[PDB]
Design a protein around this motif. Structure first.
Motif, PDB file in Angstrom:
ATOM      1  N   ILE A   1      17.153  16.125  25.985  1.00 31.29           N
ATOM      2  CA  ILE A   1      17.204  15.185  24.877  1.00 31.29           C
ATOM      3  C   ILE A   1      18.650  14.933  24.474  1.00 31.29           C
ATOM      4  N   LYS A   2      19.469  15.974  24.573  1.00 30.95           N
ATOM      5  CA  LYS A   2      20.880  15.876  24.225  1.00 30.95           C
ATOM      6  C   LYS A   2      21.610  14.971  25.207  1.00 30.95           C
ATOM      7  N   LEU A   3      21.180  15.003  26.463  1.00 30.96           N
ATOM      8  CA  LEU A   3      21.808  14.211  27.510  1.00 30.96           C
ATOM      9  C   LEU A   3      21.333  12.761  27.633  1.00 30.96           C
ATOM     10  N   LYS A   4      20.025  12.552  27.742  1.00 29.47           N
ATOM     11  CA  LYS A   4      19.497  11.199  27.890  1.00 29.47           C
ATOM     12  C   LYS A   4      18.696  10.686  26.701  1.00 29.47           C
ATOM     13  N   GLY A   5      18.646  11.460  25.621  1.00 27.46           N
ATOM     14  CA  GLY A   5      17.923  11.016  24.438  1.00 27.46           C
ATOM     15  C   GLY A   5      16.468  11.427  24.332  1.00 27.46           C
TER      16      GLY A   5
ATOM     17  N   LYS B   1      23.818  10.428  30.520  1.00 28.26           N
ATOM     18  CA  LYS B   1      22.483   9.909  30.804  1.00 28.26           C
ATOM     19  C   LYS B   1      22.069  10.331  32.210  1.00 28.26           C
ATOM     20  N   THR B   2      22.908  10.007  33.187  1.00 30.82           N
ATOM     21  CA  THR B   2      22.620  10.348  34.571  1.00 30.82           C
ATOM     22  C   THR B   2      22.312  11.833  34.722  1.00 30.82           C
ATOM     23  N   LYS B   3      23.098  12.674  34.060  1.00 28.42           N
ATOM     24  CA  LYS B   3      22.908  14.117  34.139  1.00 28.42           C
ATOM     25  C   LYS B   3      21.570  14.539  33.545  1.00 28.42           C
ATOM     26  N   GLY B   4      21.231  13.954  32.400  1.00 29.32           N
ATOM     27  CA  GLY B   4      19.980  14.280  31.740  1.00 29.32           C
ATOM     28  C   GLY B   4      18.785  13.729  32.485  1.00 29.32           C
TER      29      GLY B   4
ATOM     30  N   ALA C   1       7.397   6.794  25.659  1.00 30.02           N
ATOM     31  CA  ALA C   1       7.985   7.048  26.970  1.00 30.02           C
ATOM     32  C   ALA C   1       7.079   7.943  27.805  1.00 30.02           C
ATOM     33  N   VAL C   2       6.466   8.940  27.166  1.00 26.62           N
ATOM     34  CA  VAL C   2       5.557   9.862  27.852  1.00 26.62           C
ATOM     35  C   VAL C   2       4.299   9.135  28.317  1.00 26.62           C
ATOM     36  N   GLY C   3       3.629   8.460  27.388  1.00 25.91           N
ATOM     37  CA  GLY C   3       2.421   7.732  27.734  1.00 25.91           C
ATOM     38  C   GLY C   3       2.642   6.697  28.828  1.00 25.91           C
TER      39      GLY C   3
END
Lengths: 313, 307, 313, 307
Positions: free
Chosen positions: D219-223, A41-44, D14-16
């Protein structure tokens, strides 16, 4: 000389994430290291936050570790373990302490010797706990305390009177939470007391005012019920406090500060207007409270002190 | 649509020019027209100001003519010639030559008056123009108040933005400090003194005295004063153009407040896109009320005599 | 830790005065000490500048002395002795050196070890002189050089094409003064070269462009002839450079930097785009110049080098 | 006068929401109405955003209805449902239910489209609304460009504001980097490499590759991804509301440029109070021109098929 302000953020939740974003948009500090159990998460997030940089002042944003706090000016603690259903206040405190110790000790061991800004809940309790685990001076350990409650109280009064909230001056004090209270006695709009404002605008029933605080007190529950969580307010308050410290402003802000006789309290961190700057807390303002308000403060403090006492034993 | 804010500045002296710079730096408004008798001066000034533009948001800056006020959002008057009644009449003629040709242009935005005597000329502007009361504003005691707050701030070592105190009445000798409501972080001055007895009561007295004579002392040191009013004016402008509903000490029309009527005098007021929205009537103590009364009285005197 | 940025300003003329005011309005640094032979002006200016504070972030502004530079991050030199009529370039330099030495030596003696930002005219010459009298590293001595000329060049191109000057990218290089030149080869609007812009907008005669630089070159004479002096431009450029340093941005800016082979020059400070940050000059950009432009740079440098040589002997 | 800037935001994801926060923080506009199917979500969000207001300039923020777009200066669309042709048709129906009721409200300000596929939906918005070409804007490759510049900036260690490079064509797989004009402080990338040979040519290649797949990796990292576009959108807004005439990479209508016609595609353009004023046609190399051609082609294909 090297003017490079570095901030270490512990907790990449909606609060931490937003805080960082607020720092980016306003250009506060030149580096933010994001530390969190969930390394991905932190990385992204560091990447997403940096994507925004070309539209503001530059920064170095990355997934960090506790050791990266070595030369940090600030350490912001934001993600306490939430209170499960049926869990006692004291048990919420105890499960967070084990977690807190696991954060404070290694940051202190990195060499870090700046200022601790605590936002984790319960904030006042964890502020004092942070002070106790860190050993840092009382004025170098700050909790967000009632800054957001106070902001929410001011925006509310502003909407009612249709005036810029920055021309509204009112506080919410005591421990952040159910036992907090409004300092109506010294609340004013442009210097004009609320009482005075009411006695010139009788349309304002004492009911609306009473409900107005009730709503601020329960603000978090309402927002959570609606959007599922709350974060813009606290993130914005956090960036404000950071700015006051990093820009050495000596600004007066509602924060959780160590008590040494003020309000008739001792050895606990609780919400009160204070002067803060590059060196942390300077002057702890002590509003001459109303008898009723002093009681509200006493009650708030007492309850918090008992829990705090039981906590450390 | 037509999201273009236009300001017309009359008077390119140190105050006028400094104000323009402050607008450039903070990026307030998109166009600034500078009107003044010395066309060359205003031309060199608009070029000098435009030279700073690549370091801030863009603006159109140029030497202007009253006729350019046709579609201006705001007209800022700083052109005020240096017996009090005489001073007034010589400014009432200059002011007329400014206001009339600007109103003839078609202008119907807001008038911001900064020329001394501000309160009087603020009133005169209102009468000469015919504009609604809430659309003629004077800087009044905005600067006095800022100076008052900065002074308290230095004494106590606290950001002035956390200090709240006013200077009221007509901007000049008769202005007074509203000590009864002055506070720091909401903590009253009276209360602040109790907690910090090192602050002698006479130090407070000198403080306001130093504020009342502020212009004199500065002029004595550097020859003139302008950064303060320039900043105050730009503050008042951001309040209007950004429709903030901010509380600022300005010269506004009296219609009962403090028991006064038919005059523009300094007092806290809510301001926004449409000028003055609400006049904050602070409950002055007996002492302060008198000060307010006398200041009004002497001002109303000249006002009537002048007209 | 103590995040308190202090700036010492030498010279309280219209340039210094305005510079300070620009610092106040944008909230740059937390302290400005104003040093000038005329102690009263500085004192009256510090008060007038502080009158403005309650409308921006706080600062400590006062009439200062050279010793107050002890712990300063920055030292800004702005008021060189003007060239009298009939005075030679070399004599203008020599009368300023005696004055410069009288400023640099005592500041260096205060303990000061930050960055020197020189705006005094002749700027490039006095920059090198400041470096020589101070002994500070080459990258910790900066001259405003062609920052304003460049800004004026960009605003001019912007007005012609009606585009935000921040989307216009063009430089004026060489020694600040008559011998400077436009770097048309790499000038562009949003990445679109001037040449390319012209070959798509033929209405732009090569005459207008030639006159456009001529006007930038003589900009100061025009403004001085009109308003009697020039100061907003340089003050704004000075605050920009200060911001880049104090906020450690690594921003590219036209500045006067020591030459070590770039453009075929050596041992002189001259105007060129460079990367600057908290530690001064980092990367000295070297635009691959046109043959004609390289000549213009050579000529500018040579002339400046001769004067510089004669100056120190 | 009426110095009140109003923004209507459609889509509270999230964008809005992030975009709204960015407007609050930078103090852009005075009112923000948030429209979305989940009324409770938008209500909790407007309250959460308003809670930040006392730390910035004031604004009126609330859950809104399309009808509130009546006097809005700007309408920002972020509501885009997740075969390409299918994706398009399901968004063309949702987009219609947004645009039509907003146009029926009386809205005639500017449309800013951020929903994917942005370029297509930007075109669709233009057709569904009937608005002038220069009053329907798409974010296009604004974010790709920012990411592209930040990447170069980190490589070279230079403030991205001193880096100038574009990502062009349709926002998506076919987008390409205009290397021929990319520069740092005006110093070309090609030239920068000559002076700094440590920068391998294949590192540059990966750099753009990483930009093209940027969303995927994040998206892969934080969704999800939102801070970038949110900031870009707020940048585009400041350009309009402050009438800046700024050059930004946006999805604009093609009328000859690059030999294209009847499509909205990404390219540098001058923007201001009245939307698009000038379309910057960069002289692309043969290589880049093809990239531009192919990207257009495949986009025009879907466009025609969709309609």
């Amino acid at each position: 000389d090297k003017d490079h302000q570095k901030v270490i953020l512990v907790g990449d939740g909606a609060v931490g994430s937003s805080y960082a974003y607020a720092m980016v948009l306003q250009g506060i500090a030149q580096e933010i290291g994001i530390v969190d159990i969930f390394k991905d998460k932190t990385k992204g997030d560091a990447i997403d936050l940096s994507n925004a940089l070309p539209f503001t002042s530059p920064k170095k944003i990355y997934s960090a570790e506790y050791s990266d706090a070595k030369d940090a000016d600030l350490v912001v603690i934001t993600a306490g373990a939430p209170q499960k259903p049926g869990e006692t206040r004291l048990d919420l405190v105890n499960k967070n302490l084990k977690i807190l110790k696991s954060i404070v000790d290694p940051i202190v061991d990195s060499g870090f010797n700046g200022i601790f800004l605590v936002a984790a809940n319960p904030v006042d309790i964890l502020t004092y706990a942070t002070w106790k685990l860190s050993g840092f001076p009382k004025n170098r350990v700050v909790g967000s305390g009632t800054s957001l409650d106070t902001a929410r109280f001011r925006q509310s009064i502003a909407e009612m009177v249709n005036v810029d909230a920055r021309s509204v001056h009112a506080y919410i004090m005591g421990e952040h939470g159910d036992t907090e209270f409004p300092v109506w006695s010294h609340a004013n709009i442009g210097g004009v007391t609320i009482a005075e404002w009411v006695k010139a605008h009788p349309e304002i029933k004492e009911d609306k005012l009473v409900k107005m605080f009730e709503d601020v007190r329960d603000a978090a529950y309402e927002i959570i019920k609606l959007k599922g969580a709350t974060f813009y307010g606290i993130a914005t308050a956090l960036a404000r406090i950071s700015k006051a410290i990093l820009n050495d402003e000596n600004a007066v802000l509602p924060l959780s500060v160590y008590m040494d006789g003020q309000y008739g309290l001792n050895d606990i961190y609780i919400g009160t207007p204070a002067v803060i700057n590059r060196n942390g807390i300077q002057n702890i303002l002590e509003i001459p409270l109303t008898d009723h308000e002093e009681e509200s403060m006493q009650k708030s403090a007492s309850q918090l002190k008992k829990v705090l006492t039981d906590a450390f034993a």
